[PDB]
Design a protein around this nucleic acid. Structure first.
Ligand SMILES: Cc1cc2nc3c(=O)[nH]c(=O)nc-3n(C[C@H](O)[C@H](O)[C@H](O)COP(=O)(O)OP(=O)(O)OC[C@H]3O[C@@H](n4cnc5c(N)ncnc54)[C@H](O)[C@@H]3O)c2cc1C
Length: 508
DNA sequence: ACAGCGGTCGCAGGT
DNA sequence: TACCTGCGACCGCTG
């Protein structure tokens, strides 16, 4: 066994065993040629990034848990995870030689950074004699094929996108890979010979530098929890079939939706598996909703944003972004800081921003509320600042999805009915008239009557004292007046739309 | 051409 | 309940 070659699967996203072609191919190959190969499933961890502030503690914890679950599952196939510390640029040249790699597989990714990184690896592999198999299993439909089907253009409307993808084939959904037979552990490389635990899963202490930012562990990481959570969500087939996104609550104390987003984001759950489960349920349920609103439709919204994002390296910025309306956002540093930390003085908005920071997930319509307030609705701050904060705090932080919906919400792309504006005060009342959500995440206001808990400034000073929370002392004065600024912002939006119309017809 | 339709998720005030 | 209308007057697509 001093003559074996190594087959490598590289996990970046797709942190799962189920429905993983790139991974299954590796395991099938090893079992086909017994005694021929060694198998190294790996995750590359840059130890320098741990202090990057664009990754919150909660997301680090989620990744830590995911890596441990992935190692446990690989253990059952007579394998394990190898978490190799370093950067791909130095790691691969070293391990290609060290491990005598014959093949390298991974799941493809459309994010710019990932496109250039992978291209470098492909170039190295080519020159070094290592075969590379890539698979597009992160999404149901391959953005490339969708764009090609639509004559070289990413569809910019949902219904057109649907019209294209129903013409495309849906790939077969795989099971978990086969158990490796006659696979002894590979010989230690020079790094392992020095430290036997060099490729072990990172500890919490290792991945999480600021444990004080950790909140309640409501959504544990990993494929196991992913599948358990999915199964629980699909248990009630009526709820699933009649799902309409607009009717789900932003402020329910428990999630009104599936909360599968962190799992789909990391690849802990296969979007293709989830799509298949849904379809089987809809066939059994005669009464059911349709896209855009349906649960299947939500999954297609994921696919839509990935397709437009795949055609635009600047997707996450206003300038140079083909889709994006050019809007004169302003700098408001105090207001930005107050929004960022849930200190706007709008209890509903503050409640949401605090849940987000604490727990890593907020409901889609809660995101609408705070995104609207930040941008077109009140503060007139750029969506790129909001995007940045979300990137830091969300467990499900996704380059394409985050950019896409921020553009939607700011009416910069895809959505253009800017006359519709969420009220920081009224929107939440509909589903939570008593303000239970506010009382929980803004505890200082928990004695306010429902009559003014969404608008504490309506309470007199004597009232404020009787509720044991005086505005300007225990809770902030509202940083702006929604009833005024939103009307003026509407006109700013109309004005900016006009300027863009000129430019568009001006190039003709 | 340029109008009419549809567009995941507005609000307030009706009924 | 779950519709409805006024508000003021958007874009992409279609033909
Ligand atoms: C300003 C803003 C930023 C956002 N940033 C992200 C992000 O960084 N990462 C992320 O995954 N989602 C993001 N979303 C979309 C959406 O809010 C979340 O996907 C959803 O809240 C996750 O909860 P869920 O899993 O219960 O969704 P469900 O309603 O159960 O839907 C199921 C799955 O469909 C997909 N999905 C649902 N809604 C959307 C949507 N609007 N766009 C794309 N895919 C969707 C997700 O994969 C979700 O897990 C953002 C939305 C807004 C308005």
């Amino acid at each position: 066994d001093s003559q074996r070659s190594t087959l490598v699967h590289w996990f970046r996203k797709g942190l799962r065993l189920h429905d993983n072609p790139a991974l299954s191919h590796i395991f099938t190959a090893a079992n086909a040629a017994p005694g021929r190969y060694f198998v190294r499933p790996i995750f590359i961890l840059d130890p320098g990034i741990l202090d990057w502030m664009q990754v919150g503690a909660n997301r680090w914890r989620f990744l830590q848990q995911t890596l441990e679950d992935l190692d446990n599952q690989l253990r059952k196939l007579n394998s394990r995870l190898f978490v190799v510390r370093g950067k791909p640029a130095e790691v691969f040249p070293r391990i290609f030689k060290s491990w005598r790699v014959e093949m390298l597989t991974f799941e493809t990714d459309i994010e710019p950074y990932s496109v250039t990184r992978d291209a470098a690896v492909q170039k190295l592999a080519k020159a070094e004699g290592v075969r590379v198999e890539t698979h597009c299993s992160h999404t149901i439909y391959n953005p490339e094929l969708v764009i090609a089907k639509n004559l070289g253009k990413a569809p910019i409307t949902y219904q057109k996108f649907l019209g294209i993808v129903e013409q495309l084939k849906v790939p077969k959904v795989l099971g978990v890979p086969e158990k490796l037979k006659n696979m002894p552990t590979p010989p230690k490389d020079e790094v392992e010979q020095k430290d036997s635990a060099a490729y072990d899963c990172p500890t919490m202490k290792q991945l999480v530098k600021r444990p004080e930012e950790l909140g309640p562990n409501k959504f544990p990481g990993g494929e196991t929890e992913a599948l358990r959570r999915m199964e629980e969500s699909l248990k009630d087939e009526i709820w699933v079939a009649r799902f309409e996104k607009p009717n789900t609550a932003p402020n329910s104390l428990e999630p009104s939706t599936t909360v599968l987003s962190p799992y789909l984001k990391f690849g802990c759950l296969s979007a293709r598996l989830f799509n298949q489960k849904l379809k089987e349920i809809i066939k059994r349920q005669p009464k059911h909703s349709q896209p855009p609103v349906s649960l299947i439709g939500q999954l297609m919204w994921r696919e839509f944003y990935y397709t437009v994002a795949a055609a635009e390296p600047n997707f996450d910025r206003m300038l140079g972004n083909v889709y994006c309306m050019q809007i004169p956002w302003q700098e408001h540093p105090d207001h930005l800081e107050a929004w960022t930390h849930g200190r706007t003085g709008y209890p509903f908005i503050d409640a949401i921003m605090r849940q987000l920071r604490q727990e890593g997930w907020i409901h889609h319509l809660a995101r609408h509320a705070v995104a609207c307030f930040l941008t077109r609705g009140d503060l007139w701050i750029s969506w790129e600042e909001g995007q940045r904060v979300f990137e830091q705090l969300l467990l499900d932080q996704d380059w394409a999805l985050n950019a896409g919906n921020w553009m939607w919400l700011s009416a910069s792309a895809f959505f253009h009915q800017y006359f519709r504006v969420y009220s920081p005060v009224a929107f939440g009342k509909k589903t939570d008239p008593q303000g239970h959500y506010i009382r929980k995440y803004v505890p200082e206001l928990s004695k306010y009557p429902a009559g003014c808990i969404y608008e504490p400034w309506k309470a007199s000073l004597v009232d404020q004292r009787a509720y044991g929370c005086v505005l300007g002392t225990d809770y902030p004065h509202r940083i702006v007046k929604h009833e005024v600024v939103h009307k003026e912002n509407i006109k700013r939006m109309g004005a900016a739309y006009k300027v863009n119309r000129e430019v568009r017809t001006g190039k003709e």
